[PDB]
Structure formats: structure tokens, C-alpha cells
């Protein structure tokens, strides 16, 4: 009976639905477990008074979408992959948790007599982008007494060499310049607890993968988070963030795309990162995780069962192409001891209620966001496919769409391939991407 929009409510009134609408309003898609709620406004945020004062004085009146969601994850010391393009407020999204961390260290702990390099390094692919980041970092950092030094090309080595001697809290750099400096020990990463790769896809495109690898090799290994479920446990990671000086490092990667090289970087640099993806409200394929299995038709039922046996978050939807399929597949599942609905309102209530866990259906209303869509039969055109996978929701948890492809589906391979190659939240599937039938438009 309370039908207010969330923006009419106080923070402590926010419901699950309100958070869903909220993420829809800002086009916030995520991946990872136990994502903290996004920031509704600066005032509504739990940022320290002095931090908010600097935010307010710099003029940033409202958090941008990436800032809304990434900032709270960063404040739990969690790694992040942020999918968003320059101009979207990425820089402040990563700068803010760092500034909270630095300026809240005990003075006794902020004390070091010898110069031990930066608390943070921000790596950019180009001199032009690095300077943008620098200007913004200075404007945030100076009021807070935080020093920033740029290690980039296009600047004198005297000036650069000098500035280095003075000590700093943040270094902004380009890969080529940074490796040379490390290789000559003009700078060390002894107290670095914050690693940022900005435009990692562009770094890859420029040929910087090996240099970015070699740079990682200079970070002290013993401050990396453990590779376990604990790396994305909020209670534990929050307690680690607050642990001040001795926390695990955190790493942030920003990129517009996820080709395999970028995924390699991520596997090395990051531990159980959360994904924050902004945009594509109208284009589900860009923002829904898609997986495909090529098989013969006779293999479909056993692959489905194997998938189901792995367990799922009900409800899920399985799509088939013909209504007879719908009915017979549904029977078999109820035989395997599954609660299956076929496809009026009555069906969705049970699903919504938890009664039924699996909806079987053809391309033919209105239904909740689902964790998983399975295309047991692939759609006959890419527009129907798009509409199907769109059922994981407009925003919020990416969800997963799993598609069974056979040779009878060859006429949608090229467009299916495009749908996935344009999906930064999806892994490139060489089985389809390299397939002889996915190379040219059909007809
Ligand atoms: Hg670093």
C-alpha cells in the first residue's frame, strides 16, 4: 500500500524492491556476492564529514552511477572491475575510498621517517588520460594534504626525477614510463595498498600487456588478498578495510570491454572482484552474462539435468521453440523431482512465492527478475533471443543466460556471436566465435 518512489523515502525505509528500482533508475548492473547498497546521495552516504566537505567544495553535487555503486564496495576493501567509459566519473569512484582510508589512519600510523613510495598507484594507458586523472587527483588531494606525483612521458626527466625525490601518497603513471622507473629503482612499491588499472582494454590494444605484467611483479606479494570466498565476505573485508595500515591491498580495473587479454590481467591482478557495469538498459546482451554449449539435439536433456543438479536460484526460466516441447520437457523435470510450471497469473504467484522453481515457456506477460534463463532451444532470430535473456532483469544482478546451440541454429550464429562479443560481462566463446557458420551474415 506504500507506493512511493524510493526517492520519496528515507534510507532506512528502502526495501528490496526500492533497491531494484534504484538500480534500474541508474542502470547499475552488478556481479559478485553480497554487494553493498549503492549511495543514494552524498548526505545519505556514510562518508566521513571531512570527506564530504571536500566533495561538496569540489562541486560534485551528486554521485554518478559508477560512483554510487563502486564507492561502497571500495569501502569494504573489495576488488572491482568497473565497466564504464571515461567521462562517467570513474576517477572519483576509485579516489574516494582511498582518501577515506589514508586520512583515517592514526597519526602514529601515518608516521614514517623513511620515504617508502606511494600508498597508491593509478596506471593509465596514455599521457593524455594520466594528466586528466592527475588534475582531478590534485584537486581532491591537496585540500586533504595528500601529495600526487605524475610519472609519465612528455615531461622532462629533471622535473620528473626531482619530484620523485620529495615523497608522495599517490603516483599516477603510464606503463612504459613506470616500468623504466621501477627497473632503475627511482621508485618503489613498499607501502602500496591500492592498485588501479584505468582503460585496461586500451592498454591491451597498445601492446602494454607484458609491461603491465612486469609492473605487477614489483608489488609485494604478501599483501594480496587470499583467493577464497572470504575475499568477498563483507563483514570480513570491512573489518580488514578498517584494520588501517595492515589491510590487504585492493585493486580496481576499469575497462569498456573484456577481451581475453583483459580477463588475463584480471585473473592475475584481482581476487574475487565485484563487477559494476553501467548502462545498456535497452540492450540486455551487453549487460547479461551469456554462456553457450554446442551440442547435438539428443544431448540437450542430459546437459540441462547436469546444470540443474549444480543447483540454482529459483525461479529460473527455460525457453523452448514449440508448445509441445514446453509440455514434454516440463513433464520430465517433474519426473526428476522438480517443481515446474508450463506456459496464467497463477503460475507466477507460485514462482514468486517459491512454490514452483522452474518455468518452462515458448517465445509467447510480466514476471520477476530471474537469476538464470536457459535457451534449451535457441531462438530463431536474435530479437527473440534478446527479449529472453532480458528476463534476468533490467539491472541489478547480471544473471546468466545459457544457450544450447545445434547445427539447426546456424542461421543465428553470426548475430549470436555479435551479441556475446558486445557483452563485457560475458567471456568470449571461441567455440562460437571461431565457428565456420558464425563468420558471415546469414543469407
Ligand atoms: Hg601499486
Residue numbers in the entry: 352 to 694, 703 to 723, 728 to 806
Authors' account:
The DEAD-box protein Prp28 is essential for pre-mRNA splicing as it plays a key role in the formation of an active spliceosome. Prp28 participates in the release of the U1 snRNP from the 5′-splice site during association of the U5·U4/U6 tri-snRNP, which is a crucial step in the transition from a pre-catalytic spliceosome to an activated spliceosome. Human Prp28 (hPrp28; also denoted U5-100K) comprises 820 amino-acid residues. The helicase core with the conserved sequence motifs corresponds to the C-terminal half of the protein.
